[PDB]
Curated annotation (Swiss-Prot), chain B:
It comes from Arabidopsis thaliana (Mouse-ear cress). This is Pseudouridine kinase. It comes from the Eukaryota. GO terms for molecular function: ATP binding; kinase activity; metal ion binding. The keyword Kinase applies.
Length: 356, 355
């Protein structure tokens, strides 16, 4: 009952300059191709963790597609290929700290050609999935078709918001969505989408960040999202759920060491925990959030609970920021396990002194 | 006796935003791949004009190489490929006015892996070449090795200056070079490199052709007195200056396609020691200036390779450059030879003596 992953397959061009980029000219640096796209990365990540996902997406019959498919070891049955399709390309120029200085995304093939008509061919895979992961590169209509199919079979849906603009596609599907994984800005954009107004604004301690984000988080939850995971970069992640997180969504290494009886307080309408990350040496930050999703989905797919699974996701994200690839060539399970335990044992409840 | 082309194979990545580029994330837009590198472009251009060149360069066994070689239909014999080589890429992200907002060039493989040793494997091809074209992405040692092999077999050498910085690599090979094709900026840089002092200064409005020539003449003279025989100064929409030691109607000493016959029937060889000529260009609707200087070289080299004289040949090069600026690619997917011929005629007939 494999997890089904639906969304963008993208050829990333990553330009890491040796010094500070300057308008009007080129600086020397390192320019690389990396297999990318949120859905492709998530599927890649899940597979490298020992779980087989089913990928649904679209590619051209062009050079970038060949690069993307060169080492592809999963089924391609879900991949729409047509000659009138241009394989999506993202070009990033980084700053010397590893943050994106300037970027252009050309991903219109996903919005235009990854259609309900293509996706509905796979109603069996979706309705029988352990979980459905959709990214926001899909058009609203594709998103609706996907999420309704999962929903009618009570298959939990993970919505990956992709960007501040695309995250707003939550608006027409929130009731069908079980889990979302925005960063701070995407969370605010999503809240504003669901409010149909620009009521919350973008942007220090964890309690402070949480107090700032809480109203926005509540907006998503009462619009039907059951779990909000707010990724905070080097500050880790927040896990907020409607109801107890263990029965809200509703490996052998991790399960033995990240005890499902560590946390006493495990049903409130807003449950909130902070997960720290682990000090890393960054080669490239791109693809960390995607590996957080991959690692979490893989663990959930193997029967771990959401607190354990997120710990694994955060371990996987750490491994990713230390690679030039979006997803590391390989994961080492002793490292992932070790890191997951650290994150997990370091995780804390928020709203401890509050009671509302 | 194929013309031999040595230098960069580069994947150009052009990122065109739809709106405002933002820190930390992507703006939507269009990203285009264009096969690039001065030498690869020249070889591409020559081939599309009906002449087969021999290309010497270096590529990785990676993704960018796959994209680059997807439509390459020429021999790969001269291309050094290894698994530890990262294929050159220049990545440009534009702003909405059309200027480079941020750009990164990763092209060090040319200098590090296109060595004199690799080049000497093709001494036979070079010594028998009708013409040798080198670009300045080559290391100085690679440049010296190439040009010495050509000189010893009296093969004409065309040096493409590539950029203001790399143009200065002319200094250790000037005596070996027959033809150079700098723009204004590259010309000054090259003259400064060759002089015992930096007497020339950079670039202020545009200005008339006779005046531009007068301003540039001293820098041009520095190149000639250092052994360069022909200086082609490219001037963008103002065409090109052609300055030579001895009269400009020079042909390759070779004992022929349909570029030759179209053009010669139409660009009459009886229309026409420092000689200077101005060649006008032809109004185009620019979609991208990409590839213009390279197709000028490509077109001229192709015409010389088919037996045309330098004057006829430069006229074709200017026609070819015009076609390049009307393409998104560095080199148009195709040339239409009657059109190239028609444009070359205008240029040829519009060209005038300055000195
Ligand atoms: N510098 C870092 N050190 C350790 N872990 C990190 C670091 N940066 C990110 N991570 C891990 O990656 C996760 C997601 O990071 P972030 O919130 O920056 O991703 P994003 O904003 O979705 O963008 P992307 O996924 O492209 O990185 C974080 O929750 C964290 O666990
Ligand atoms: N707008 C145009 N219309 C017609 N011909 C053009 C135009 N722009 C350039 N050309 C032709 O291209 C030739 C080269 O132009 P330019 O001198 O700008 O090249 P460059 O400075 O070497 O830049 P690049 O290497 O990017 O081509 C010119 O001599 C001209 O004949
Ligand atoms: Mg993300
Ligand atoms: Mg995220
Ligand atoms: Mg030039
Ligand atoms: Mg040039
Ligand atoms: Na990475
Ligand atoms: Na062009």
């Amino acid at each position: 009952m494999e997890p089904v992953i639906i969304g963008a397959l993208i050829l990333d061009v990553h330009a890491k300059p040796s010094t500070t980029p300057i308008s009007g000219t080129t600086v020397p640096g390192q320019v690389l191709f990396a297999p990318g796209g949120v859905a492709r990365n998530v599927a890649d990540c899940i597979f490298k963790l020992g779980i087989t996902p089913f990928m649904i997406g679209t590619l051209g019959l062009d050079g970038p597609a060949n690069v993307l498919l060169k080492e592809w070891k999963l089924s391609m049955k879900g991949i729409l290929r047509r000659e009138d399709i241009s394989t999506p390309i993202v070009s990033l120029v980084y700053d010397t700290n590893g943050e994106v200085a300037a970027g252009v995304a050309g991903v219109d093939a996903v919005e235009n050609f990854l259609t309900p008509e293509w996706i509905q061919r796979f109603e069996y895979n979706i309705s029988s999935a352990r979980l459905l992961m959709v990214d926001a590169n899909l058009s609203s209509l594709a998103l609706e078709a996907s999420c309704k199919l999962a929903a009618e079979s009570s298959v939990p849906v993970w919505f990956e918001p992709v960007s501040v603009t695309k995250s707003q596609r939550i608006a027409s599907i929130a009731k069908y969505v079980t889990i979302v994984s925005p960063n701070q800005d995407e969370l605010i954009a999503m809240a504003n989408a669901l409010c149909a107004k620009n009521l919350f604004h973008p942007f220090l301690s964890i309690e402070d960040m949480f107090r700032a984000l809480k109203p926005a988080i509540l907006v998503l939850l009462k619009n039907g999202v059951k779990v909000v995971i707010v990724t905070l970069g080097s500050n880790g992640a927040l896990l907020c759920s409607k109801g107890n997180p263990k029965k809200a969504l509703n490996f052998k290494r991790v399960q033995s060491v990240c005890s499902p009886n560590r946390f006493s307080e495990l049903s409130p309408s807003l449950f909130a925990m902070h997960f720290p990350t682990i000090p890393a040496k960054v080669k490239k930050l791109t693809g960390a959030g995607d590996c957080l999703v991959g690692g979490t989905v893989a663990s959930l797919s193997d029967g771990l609970d959401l607190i354990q699974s997120l710990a694994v996701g955060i371990a996987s994200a750490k491994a990713a920021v230390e690679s030039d690839d979006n997803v590391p060539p390989e994961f080492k399970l002793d490292l992932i396990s070790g890191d997951a335990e650290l994150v997990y044992n370091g995780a804390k409840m928020l709203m401890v002194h509050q009671s509302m």
